[PDB]
Amino acid sequence: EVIQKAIEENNNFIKMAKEKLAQKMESNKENREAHLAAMLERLQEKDKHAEEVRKNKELKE
């Protein structure tokens, strides 16, 4: 019982490590790209704005 417990706890420690690592890389890639998603979408309301100002300038005559 003792040696199969030393084995079981070494394995559960590897297990949880393996998982805590995988779960954090997934939360990180998500969070990082959401911030790049958020950053680019910000820049594109600037692109869409840079035209409503240019198109507005044609609406004169």
Partner: protein, 424 residues
């Protein structure tokens, strides 16, 4: 023809085992090559008890060298008599047990134990009539302590009606490898109480003091300590190795030394303590060997009572004088022997002394003051275990706290069992 299988286990086990075999191979006329070159033939009458017969009938010890690292064992076999040991009888792993009882008993030792029992089986199958096993080991390390008591658990299983007999070195803070020693040793003692018939308690505290106070060695080495042990061990076993009116075997010895099966831890003593040109006179032999300063276990015999005693004198001397002096020490000090075991002191004499000493006397005492040793180890244990300190080294190998309190318990009981017979 009553052989013993000797097993030395661990660092301390195999270092002490090593000197014991050179000490007594000198006593039996065997050279470092295993060849007999002695004068007498009393050197060869009980030879079969410790040595198997060989090539052109050389003598190989009936010894099994066990460790979980090779370091000590390479050292043994490259040492003096290291050639006499049967190379097949060198059983060793590689990882070591890290001064960790659990590694010796449950994980690392568990992996190696089967290979050892293969050697014990081939050593013991070659025995017209095997009588028992003697194990040498410390109890504060990992291999000799944890694996050694595992080996005893197993040998008892395969050989339940043989005598199991150990020489066990107790840790002491004065001479300590690591801080976990009281743990390793409390766990070994729980085993020894159940699975041995006799254990000689060699305390490393007492060996240090004898070396410092008595032998005047300012800073003793382990070799200086094992000098005292290989002399006591030669002493304790001279009846098994030499013929006498005493037909001494392990079972008769245990029958008369052990009144209660758990109370089988003996206080060895030796005299004279040497590291010398006037042989001691018999009156001094017997005064010295009963002096607390000549005990190997670091308990005061005047703090308890002798359940039983076995003394042996080596040399040619007045057989009547040892009778007289032995009988006289009992009445100078009858307050310290139990009234309810008549004739509890027994004395042998051997005409062949140890190397270098013309007259020597070795003492084996089943005293209730051995309780001091377990009280000592128990205080240390509790001191750490109340704060569960250093336990992770063990829970990391499967052990549970519960196994520890059980071992604390069984040893505190053994201390109670010893106190109750000090009062009778």
């Amino acid at each position: 023809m009553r052989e013993i299988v000797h097993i030395q286990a661990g660092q301390c086990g195999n270092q002490i085992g090593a000197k014991f075999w050179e000490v007594i191979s000198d006593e039996h006329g065997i050279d470092p090559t295993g060849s007999y070159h002695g004068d007498s033939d009393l050197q060869l009458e009980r030879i079969n008890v410790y040595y198997n017969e060989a090539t052109g009938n050389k003598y190989v010890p009936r010894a099994i060298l066990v460790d979980l690292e090779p370091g000590t064992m390479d050292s043994v076999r490259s040492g003096p008599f290291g050639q006499i040991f049967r190379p097949d009888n060198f059983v060793f792993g590689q990882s070591g047990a890290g001064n960790n009882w659990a590694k010796g008993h449950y994980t690392e030792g568990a992996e190696l134990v089967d290979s050892v029992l293969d050697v014990v089986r081939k050593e013991s199958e070659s025995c017209d009539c095997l009588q028992g096993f003697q194990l040498t080991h410390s109890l504060g390390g990992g291999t000799g302590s944890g694996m050694g008591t595992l080996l005893i658990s197993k040998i008892r299983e395969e050989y339940p009606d043989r005598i199991m007999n150990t020489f066990s070195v107790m840790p002491s803070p004065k001479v300590s490898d690591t801080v976990v020693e009281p743990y390793n040793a409390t766990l070994s003692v729980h085993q020894l109480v159940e699975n041995t018939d006799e254990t000689y308690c060699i305390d490393n505290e007492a060996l240090y003091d004898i070396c410092f106070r008595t032998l005047k060695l300012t800073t003793p080495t382990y070799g200086d300590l094992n000098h005292l042990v290989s002399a006591t061990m030669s002493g304790v076993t001279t009846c098994l190795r030499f013929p006498g009116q005493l037909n001494a075997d392990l079972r008769k010895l245990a029958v008369n030394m052990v009144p209660f099966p758990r109370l089988h831890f003996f206080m060895p003593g030796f005299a004279p303590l040497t590291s010398q040109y006037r042989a001691l006179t018999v009156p001094e032999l017997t005064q010295q060997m009963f002096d607390s300063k000549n005990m190997m276990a670091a308990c005061d015999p005047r703090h308890g009572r002798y359940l039983t005693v076995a003394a042996i004198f080596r040399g040619r001397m007045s057989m009547k004088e040892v009778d007289e002096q032995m009988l006289n020490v009992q009445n100078k000090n009858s307050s310290y022997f139990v009234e309810w075991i008549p004739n509890n002191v027994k004395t042998a004499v051997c005409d062949i002394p140890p190397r270098g000493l013309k007259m020597s006397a070795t003492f084996i005492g089943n005293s209730t003051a051995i309780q001091e040793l377990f009280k000592r180890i128990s205080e240390q244990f509790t001191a750490m275990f109340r704060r569960k300190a250093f336990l992770h080294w063990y829970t990391g190998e499967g052990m549970d706290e519960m196994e520890f309190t059980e071992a604390e318990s069984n040893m505190n009981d053994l201390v109670s069992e010893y106190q109750q017979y000090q009062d009778a």
